[PDB]
PDB file of C-alpha atoms in Angstrom:
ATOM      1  CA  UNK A  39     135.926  -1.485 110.459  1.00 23.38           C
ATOM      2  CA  UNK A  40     139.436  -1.857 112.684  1.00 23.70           C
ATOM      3  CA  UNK A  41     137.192  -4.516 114.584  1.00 26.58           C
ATOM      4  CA  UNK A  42     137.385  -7.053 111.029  1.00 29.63           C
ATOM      5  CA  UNK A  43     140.733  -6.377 111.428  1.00 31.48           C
ATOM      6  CA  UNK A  44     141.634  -7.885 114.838  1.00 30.67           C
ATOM      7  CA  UNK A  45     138.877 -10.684 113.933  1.00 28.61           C
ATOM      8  CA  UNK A  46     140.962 -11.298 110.724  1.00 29.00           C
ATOM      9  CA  UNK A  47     144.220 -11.730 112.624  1.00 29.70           C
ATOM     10  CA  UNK A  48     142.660 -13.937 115.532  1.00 28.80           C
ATOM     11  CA  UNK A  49     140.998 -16.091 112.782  1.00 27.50           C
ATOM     12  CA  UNK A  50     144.258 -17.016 111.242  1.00 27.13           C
ATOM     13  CA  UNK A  51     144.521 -19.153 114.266  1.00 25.94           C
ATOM     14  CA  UNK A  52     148.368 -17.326 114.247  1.00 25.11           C
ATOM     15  CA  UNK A  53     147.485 -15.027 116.595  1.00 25.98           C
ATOM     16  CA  UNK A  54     145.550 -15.070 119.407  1.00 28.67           C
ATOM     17  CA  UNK A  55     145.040 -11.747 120.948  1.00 28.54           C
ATOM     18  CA  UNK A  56     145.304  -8.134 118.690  1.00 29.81           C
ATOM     19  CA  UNK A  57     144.612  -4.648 119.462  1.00 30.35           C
ATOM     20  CA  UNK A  58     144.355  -1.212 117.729  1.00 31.51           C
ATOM     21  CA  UNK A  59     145.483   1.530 119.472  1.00 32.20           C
ATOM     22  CA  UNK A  60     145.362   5.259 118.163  1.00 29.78           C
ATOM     23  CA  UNK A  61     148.842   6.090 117.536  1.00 34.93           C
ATOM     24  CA  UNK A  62     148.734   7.507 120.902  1.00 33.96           C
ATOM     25  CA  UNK A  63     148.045   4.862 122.881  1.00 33.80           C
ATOM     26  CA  UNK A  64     144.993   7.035 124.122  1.00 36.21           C
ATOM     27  CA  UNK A  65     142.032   4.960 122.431  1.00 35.91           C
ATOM     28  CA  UNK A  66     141.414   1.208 121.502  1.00 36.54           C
ATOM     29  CA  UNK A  67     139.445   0.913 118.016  1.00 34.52           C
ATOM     30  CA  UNK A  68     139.781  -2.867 118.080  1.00 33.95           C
ATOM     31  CA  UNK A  69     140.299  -6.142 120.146  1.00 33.18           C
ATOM     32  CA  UNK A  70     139.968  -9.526 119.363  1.00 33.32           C
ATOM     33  CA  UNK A  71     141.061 -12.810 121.956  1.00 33.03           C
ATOM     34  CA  UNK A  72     140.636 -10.800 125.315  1.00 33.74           C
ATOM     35  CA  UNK A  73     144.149  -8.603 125.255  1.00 32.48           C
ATOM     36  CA  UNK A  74     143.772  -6.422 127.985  1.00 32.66           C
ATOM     37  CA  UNK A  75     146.859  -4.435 128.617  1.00 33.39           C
ATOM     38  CA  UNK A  76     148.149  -3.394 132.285  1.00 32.37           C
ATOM     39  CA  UNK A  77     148.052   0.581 133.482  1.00 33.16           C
ATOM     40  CA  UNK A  78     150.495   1.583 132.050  1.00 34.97           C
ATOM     41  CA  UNK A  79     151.900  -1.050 129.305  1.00 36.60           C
ATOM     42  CA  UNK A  80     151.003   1.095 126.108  1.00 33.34           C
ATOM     43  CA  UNK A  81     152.774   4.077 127.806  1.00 31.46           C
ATOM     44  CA  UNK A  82     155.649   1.715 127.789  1.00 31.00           C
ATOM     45  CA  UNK A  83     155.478   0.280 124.057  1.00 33.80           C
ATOM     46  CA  UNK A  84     154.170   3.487 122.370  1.00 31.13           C
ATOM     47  CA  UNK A  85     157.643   5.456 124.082  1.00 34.23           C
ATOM     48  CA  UNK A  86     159.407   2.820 123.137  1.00 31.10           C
ATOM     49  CA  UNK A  87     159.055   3.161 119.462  1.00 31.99           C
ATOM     50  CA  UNK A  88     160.588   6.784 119.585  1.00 31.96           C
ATOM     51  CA  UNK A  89     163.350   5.390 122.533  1.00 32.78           C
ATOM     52  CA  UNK A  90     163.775   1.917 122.461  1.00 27.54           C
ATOM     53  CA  UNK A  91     166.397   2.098 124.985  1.00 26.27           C
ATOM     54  CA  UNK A  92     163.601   3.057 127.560  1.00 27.39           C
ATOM     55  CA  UNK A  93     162.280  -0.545 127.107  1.00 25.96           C
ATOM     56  CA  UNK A  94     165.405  -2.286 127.075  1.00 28.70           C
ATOM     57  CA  UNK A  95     166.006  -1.310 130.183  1.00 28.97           C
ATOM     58  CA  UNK A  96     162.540  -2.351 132.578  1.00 28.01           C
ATOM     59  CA  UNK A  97     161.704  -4.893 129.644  1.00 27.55           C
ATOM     60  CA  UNK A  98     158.659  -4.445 127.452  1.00 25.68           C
ATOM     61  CA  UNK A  99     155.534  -6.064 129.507  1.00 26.54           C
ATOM     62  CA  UNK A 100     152.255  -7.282 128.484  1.00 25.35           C
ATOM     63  CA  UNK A 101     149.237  -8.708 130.287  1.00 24.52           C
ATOM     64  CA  UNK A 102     151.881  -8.821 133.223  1.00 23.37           C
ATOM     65  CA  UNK A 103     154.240 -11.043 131.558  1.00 21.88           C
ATOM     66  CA  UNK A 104     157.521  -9.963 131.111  1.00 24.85           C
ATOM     67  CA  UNK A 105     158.870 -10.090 127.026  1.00 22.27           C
ATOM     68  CA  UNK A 106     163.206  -9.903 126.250  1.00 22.84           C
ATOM     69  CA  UNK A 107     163.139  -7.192 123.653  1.00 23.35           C
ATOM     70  CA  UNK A 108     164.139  -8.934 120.444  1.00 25.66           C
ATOM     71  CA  UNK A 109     163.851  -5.801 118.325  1.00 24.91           C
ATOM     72  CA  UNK A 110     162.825  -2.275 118.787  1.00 25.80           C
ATOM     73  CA  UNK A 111     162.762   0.606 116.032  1.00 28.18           C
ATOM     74  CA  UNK A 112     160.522   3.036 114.463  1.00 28.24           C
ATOM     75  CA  UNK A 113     157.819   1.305 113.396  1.00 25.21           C
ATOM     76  CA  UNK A 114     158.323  -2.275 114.859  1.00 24.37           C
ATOM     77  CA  UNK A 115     158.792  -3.714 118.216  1.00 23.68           C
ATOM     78  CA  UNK A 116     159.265  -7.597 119.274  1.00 23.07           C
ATOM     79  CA  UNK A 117     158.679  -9.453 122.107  1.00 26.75           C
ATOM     80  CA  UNK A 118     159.577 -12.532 123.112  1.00 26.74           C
ATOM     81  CA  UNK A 119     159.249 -15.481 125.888  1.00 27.62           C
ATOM     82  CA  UNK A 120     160.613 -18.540 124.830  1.00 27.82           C
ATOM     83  CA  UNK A 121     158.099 -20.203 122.083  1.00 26.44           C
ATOM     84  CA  UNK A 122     155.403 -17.146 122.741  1.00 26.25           C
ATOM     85  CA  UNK A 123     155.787 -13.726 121.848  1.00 27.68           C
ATOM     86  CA  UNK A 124     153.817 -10.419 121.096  1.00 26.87           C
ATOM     87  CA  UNK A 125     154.190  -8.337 117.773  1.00 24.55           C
ATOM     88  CA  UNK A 126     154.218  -4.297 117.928  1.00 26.54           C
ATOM     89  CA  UNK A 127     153.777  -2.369 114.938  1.00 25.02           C
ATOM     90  CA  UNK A 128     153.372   1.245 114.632  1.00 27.91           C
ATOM     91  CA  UNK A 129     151.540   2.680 111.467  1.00 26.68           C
ATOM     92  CA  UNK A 130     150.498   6.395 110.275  1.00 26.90           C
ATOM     93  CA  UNK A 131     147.276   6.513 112.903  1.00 26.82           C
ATOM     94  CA  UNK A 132     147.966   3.215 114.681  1.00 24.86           C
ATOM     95  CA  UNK A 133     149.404   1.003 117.183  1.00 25.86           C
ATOM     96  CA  UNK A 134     148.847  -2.714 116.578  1.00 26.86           C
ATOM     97  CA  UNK A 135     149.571  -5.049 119.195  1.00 30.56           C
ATOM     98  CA  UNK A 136     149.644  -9.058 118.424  1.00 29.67           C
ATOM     99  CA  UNK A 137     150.427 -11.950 120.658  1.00 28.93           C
ATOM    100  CA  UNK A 138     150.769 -14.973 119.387  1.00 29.54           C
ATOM    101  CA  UNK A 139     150.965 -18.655 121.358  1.00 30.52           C
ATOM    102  CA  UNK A 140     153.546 -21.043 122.265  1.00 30.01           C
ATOM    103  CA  UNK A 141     152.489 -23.606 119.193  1.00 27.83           C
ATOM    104  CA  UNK A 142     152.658 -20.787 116.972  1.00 27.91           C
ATOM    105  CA  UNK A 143     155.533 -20.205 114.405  1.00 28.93           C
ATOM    106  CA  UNK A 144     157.368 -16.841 115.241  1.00 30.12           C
ATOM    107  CA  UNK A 145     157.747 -15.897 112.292  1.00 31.26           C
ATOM    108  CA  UNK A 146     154.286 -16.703 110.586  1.00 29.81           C
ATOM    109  CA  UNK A 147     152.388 -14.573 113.109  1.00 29.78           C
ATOM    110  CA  UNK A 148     154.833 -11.775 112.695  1.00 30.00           C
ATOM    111  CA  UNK A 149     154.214 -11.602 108.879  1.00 28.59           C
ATOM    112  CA  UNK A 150     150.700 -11.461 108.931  1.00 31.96           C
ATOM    113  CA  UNK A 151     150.721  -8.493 111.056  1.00 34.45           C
ATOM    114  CA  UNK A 152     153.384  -6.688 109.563  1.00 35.93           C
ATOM    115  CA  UNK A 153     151.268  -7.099 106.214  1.00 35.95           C
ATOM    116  CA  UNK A 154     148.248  -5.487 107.744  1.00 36.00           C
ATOM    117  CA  UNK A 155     150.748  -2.454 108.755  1.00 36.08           C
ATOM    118  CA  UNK A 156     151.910  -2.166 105.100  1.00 34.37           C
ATOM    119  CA  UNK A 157     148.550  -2.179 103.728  1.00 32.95           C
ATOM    120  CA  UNK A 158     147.402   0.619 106.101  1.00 33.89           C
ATOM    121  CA  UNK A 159     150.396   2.732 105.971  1.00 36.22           C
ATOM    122  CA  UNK A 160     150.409   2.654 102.097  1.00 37.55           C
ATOM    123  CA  UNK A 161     146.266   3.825 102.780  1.00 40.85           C
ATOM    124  CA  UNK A 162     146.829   6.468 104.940  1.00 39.60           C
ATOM    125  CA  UNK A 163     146.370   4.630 108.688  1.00 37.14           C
TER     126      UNK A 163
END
């Protein structure tokens, strides 16, 4: 059920848009709000978790829109454009992508999906 998952987030009203990607980047298992990522943008953001200096460099893009890398490691990648912003977090199996809107606290979004990675790391996803 990865498709309750992206409801769950959307429903929060603190995000959006969220997707499940395989680890990959070569298969969606969930999406919720419409996020519907350009060519070659998950190339971009599931490379950049091994070499963040690859995206610091063209910028990490989604949808289009350019994002200024605010962080970039292992498992978590930020993106931000003035009040909006996107959430990357990389699990055992999974990519999650969030964005959240303008009205939307930073912060809040970011903590609900960081939770969901902990939960499914700590199962095995």
């Amino acid at each position: 059920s990865w498709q309750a998952y992206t409801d769950n987030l959307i429903g929060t009203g603190k995000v959006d848009k969220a997707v499940i990607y395989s680890r990959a980047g070569d298969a969606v298992w969930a999406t919720s709000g419409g996020l519907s990522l350009q060519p070659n943008e998950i190339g971009e953001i599931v490379q950049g978790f091994d070499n963040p200096a690859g995206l610091q460099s063209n910028g990490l893009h989604i949808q289009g829109q350019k994002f200024m890398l605010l962080r970039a490691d292992d498992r978590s990648i930020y993106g931000r454009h003035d009040a909006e912003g996107v959430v990357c977090v990389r699990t055992k199996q999974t990519v999650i992508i969030a964005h959240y809107p303008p009205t939307v606290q930073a912060g809040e979004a970011t903590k609900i999906v960081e939770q969901l990675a902990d939960y499914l790391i700590g199962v095995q996803y």
